[PDB]
Scaffold this active site. Structure first.
Site, PDB file in Angstrom:
ATOM      1  N   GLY A   1      -5.563   2.282  -2.719  1.00 53.26           N
ATOM      2  CA  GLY A   1      -6.356   2.033  -1.517  1.00 53.26           C
ATOM      3  C   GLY A   1      -7.439   0.998  -1.700  1.00 53.26           C
ATOM      4  O   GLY A   1      -7.292   0.058  -2.488  1.00 53.26           O
TER       5      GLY A   1
ATOM      6  N   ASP B   1     -11.365  -3.577   8.529  1.00 52.00           N
ATOM      7  CA  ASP B   1     -10.159  -3.922   7.751  1.00 52.00           C
ATOM      8  C   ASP B   1      -8.891  -3.453   8.480  1.00 52.00           C
ATOM      9  O   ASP B   1      -8.078  -2.678   7.957  1.00 52.00           O
ATOM     10  CB  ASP B   1     -10.259  -3.352   6.321  1.00 52.00           C
ATOM     11  CG  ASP B   1      -9.304  -4.029   5.342  1.00 52.00           C
ATOM     12  OD1 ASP B   1      -8.663  -5.048   5.695  1.00 52.00           O
ATOM     13  OD2 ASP B   1      -9.190  -3.527   4.205  1.00 52.00           O
TER      14      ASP B   1
HETATM   15  C1  LIG Z   1      -4.624   3.525   1.253  1.00 48.93           C
HETATM   16  N1  LIG Z   1      -4.514   4.946   1.617  1.00 48.93           N
HETATM   17  N2  LIG Z   1      -5.505   5.704   1.779  1.00 48.93           N
HETATM   18  C2  LIG Z   1      -5.088   6.942   2.108  1.00 48.93           C
HETATM   19  C3  LIG Z   1      -3.715   6.892   2.136  1.00 48.93           C
HETATM   20  C4  LIG Z   1      -2.844   8.035   2.455  1.00 48.93           C
HETATM   21  N3  LIG Z   1      -1.486   7.891   2.271  1.00 48.93           N
HETATM   22  C5  LIG Z   1      -0.624   8.926   2.552  1.00 48.93           C
HETATM   23  N4  LIG Z   1       0.757   8.747   2.353  1.00 48.93           N
HETATM   24  C6  LIG Z   1       1.273   7.436   1.913  1.00 48.93           C
HETATM   25  C7  LIG Z   1       2.658   7.625   1.293  1.00 48.93           C
HETATM   26  C8  LIG Z   1       3.182   6.289   0.751  1.00 48.93           C
HETATM   27  C9  LIG Z   1       3.234   5.240   1.874  1.00 48.93           C
HETATM   28  N5  LIG Z   1       3.671   3.956   1.308  1.00 48.93           N
HETATM   29  C10 LIG Z   1       1.847   5.070   2.515  1.00 48.93           C
HETATM   30  C11 LIG Z   1       1.358   6.417   3.066  1.00 48.93           C
HETATM   31  N6  LIG Z   1      -1.131  10.120   3.022  1.00 48.93           N
HETATM   32  C12 LIG Z   1      -2.493  10.270   3.207  1.00 48.93           C
HETATM   33  C13 LIG Z   1      -3.357   9.230   2.925  1.00 48.93           C
HETATM   34  F1  LIG Z   1      -4.666   9.378   3.104  1.00 48.93           F
HETATM   35  C14 LIG Z   1      -3.366   5.608   1.822  1.00 48.93           C
HETATM   36  C15 LIG Z   1      -1.963   5.051   1.724  1.00 48.93           C
HETATM   37  C16 LIG Z   1      -1.496   5.049   0.270  1.00 48.93           C
HETATM   38  C17 LIG Z   1      -0.839   3.706  -0.051  1.00 48.93           C
HETATM   39  C18 LIG Z   1      -2.274   3.980  -0.497  1.00 48.93           C
END
Ligand SMILES: Cn1ncc(-c2nc(N[C@H]3CC[C@H]([NH3+])CC3)ncc2F)c1CC1CC1
Length: 297
Positions: free
Chosen positions: A18, A128
């Site tokens: 993140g 952002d």
């Molecule tokens: C940046 N950030 N902050 C909180 C979260 C975040 N991401 C998820 N699931 C991810 C699964 C993999 C997928 N490619 C993206 C969603 N669930 C809750 C979150 F807070 C994320 C997405 C994760 C890729 C960092």
């Protein structure tokens, strides 16, 4: 097992990174529920997780705001546990071979404007806005869009008086350069209008498949940002949105026309896209382009 936080969330594999930390899948060992866990190393010149967790608490009750399960410290890390969510709009864009239909773009727009609006009504700006920060949910929430990642978010006005932060210049472009507003490039203090302008570039990114300020190179970070800025300023919105319904150019003109203190008329902008959507004889059935590809398999 090897890594358990708050006495009950067993961390599994890494699922991404993140703004200020890494994200893991986890399982609640007492009921079997899957959750997401954000780890920030406690050895940080400037630690923000406590700050982001405070923002999430302020935002609870919003549609498409994830619920927080736990905040605390474990081993050498600050830890935040939250709802597990599904793929980002960038992930889904790639899954659809970097093409979205008009129906999909307009269904997404309706939710994106609303997610941003909610953050603004709680006196914050996101700063952002990009495809990677919009996630679809899972289970019964799989057609609900979530706006996440409040690491760069900022209070833009006082709760009592609604006086804005001071208008000023010489700010560093803090977010992503591709979706940044023109005023953010010039170092001007961001307000609500800048989140909305950014969403406009995201929508046009989906429509075109690329923005004309992509693929630029320069000797420095600052000079790449300056080339992006110059391209944004020299590209008219009518040219950027050529061959698409007039509503997209109207959106972008409206957002650029907003003054620093001025409230976007979110209802009008949602209406602008909804009248178009229904004129194209579409219905909000949540049959996105990725829904078509999954059920065919
Ligand atoms: C940046 N950030 N902050 C909180 C979260 C975040 N991401 C998820 N699931 C991810 C699964 C993999 C997928 N490619 C993206 C969603 N669930 C809750 C979150 F807070 C994320 C997405 C994760 C890729 C960092």
């Amino acid at each position: 097992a090897e890594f358990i936080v708050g006495g009950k969330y067993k961390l599994g594999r890494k699922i991404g990174s993140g703004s200020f930390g890494d994200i893991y899948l986890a399982t609640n060992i007492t009921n079997g529920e899957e959750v997401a866990v954000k780890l920030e190393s406690q050895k940080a010149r400037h630690p923000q997780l406590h700050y982001e967790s405070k923002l999430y608490k302020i935002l609870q009750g919003g549609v498409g705001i994830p619920h927080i399960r736990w905040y605390g410290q474990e081993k050498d890390y600050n830890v935040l546990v939250m709802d597990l969510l599904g793929p980002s709009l960038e992930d889904l864009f790639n899954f659809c071979s970097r093409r979205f239909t008009m129906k999909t773009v307009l269904m997404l727009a309706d939710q994106m404007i609303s997610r941003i609006e909610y953050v603004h009504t709680k006196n914050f700006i996101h700063r952002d806005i990009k495809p990677d920060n919009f996630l679809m949910g899972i289970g019964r929430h799989c057609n609900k869009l979530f706006l996440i990642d409040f690491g760069l978010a900022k209070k833009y006005r006082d709760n009592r008086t609604r006086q804005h932060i001071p208008y000023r210049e010489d700010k560093n472009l803090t977010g992503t350069a591709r979706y940044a507003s023109i005023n953010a490039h010039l170092g001007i203090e961001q307000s609500r209008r800048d989140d909305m302008e950014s969403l406009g570039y995201v929508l046009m990114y989906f429509n075109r498949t690329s923005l004309p300020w992509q693929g630029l190179k320069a000797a420095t970070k600052k000079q790449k940002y300056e080339k992006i800025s110059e391209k944004k300023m020299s590209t008219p919105v009518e040219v950027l949105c050529k061959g698409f319904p007039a509503e997209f150019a109207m959106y972008l003109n409206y957002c650029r026309g907003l003054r620093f203190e001025e409230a976007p008329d979110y209802m009008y902008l949602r209406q602008l896209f909804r009248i178009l959507f229904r004129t194209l004889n579409h219905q909000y059935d949540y049959t996105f382009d990725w829904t078509m590809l999954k059920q065919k398999a």
